[PDB]
Amino acid sequence: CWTTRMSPPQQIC
């Protein structure tokens, strides 16, 4: 799982 830094923020696993 990672979280995007740029808007919109989202969780990608």
Added chain:
Amino acid sequence: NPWTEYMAKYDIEEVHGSGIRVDLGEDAEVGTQYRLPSGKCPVFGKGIIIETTFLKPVAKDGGFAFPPTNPLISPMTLNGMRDFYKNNEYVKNLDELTLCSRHAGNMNPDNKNSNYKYPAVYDYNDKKCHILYIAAQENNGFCFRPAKDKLFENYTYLSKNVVDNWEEVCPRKNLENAKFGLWVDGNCEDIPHVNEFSANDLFECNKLVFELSASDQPKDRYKSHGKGYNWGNYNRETQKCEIFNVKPTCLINNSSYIATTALSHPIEVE
């Protein structure tokens, strides 16, 4: 010196600022500090040889690249990335290398804001950005080493810091009929001392220069900051790769020569 503006891209210390063979010029925390690539220029033709090819996702049955994700953000094509960021005007129109670098830099492993940004490889062959889960580049005490190689010629190694105007300020092409020199009192003089390595063609010279170039680990203490044997004058007639470690400040016209750097593509000339 009328060469000043033109030669700026060959001041690798200034425009790249980190290791080339092994780029580990910064540190970032995720509690624990880690080393990570930070060179401002793309490294054309650089790949990693595993002694499983390295663009395979991490699992020793796996490679260096990001594991499968939902949605699949690595590997991701150029068009895939442009679509992914279609609402971000500051990103959607970046060139393929910078975009790939920014895409990799988008994925925060600390799920708090952290400074850790993965390096990446853009493969010109099928227009795919591969985020590298493993930022390591050499372990020859899984054993592996960085190299330029025919298999890697369309690969491009990208740190988190790749500048958006690399095309303008970074080396890419080799300079045909040109020899790097030093400008002294209104004339372009030869590099006074060079280290001569035999090389069958330009590719092998580029490969050798890369092997000897700025490196941030042996084989703050280890950081090159871009200093090293980053340049080579290839004499195609005597088949000599003339390698040196001081920045060139002018060009000499000489049809026997091709000017290359560790950062440059191993084949392309202009």
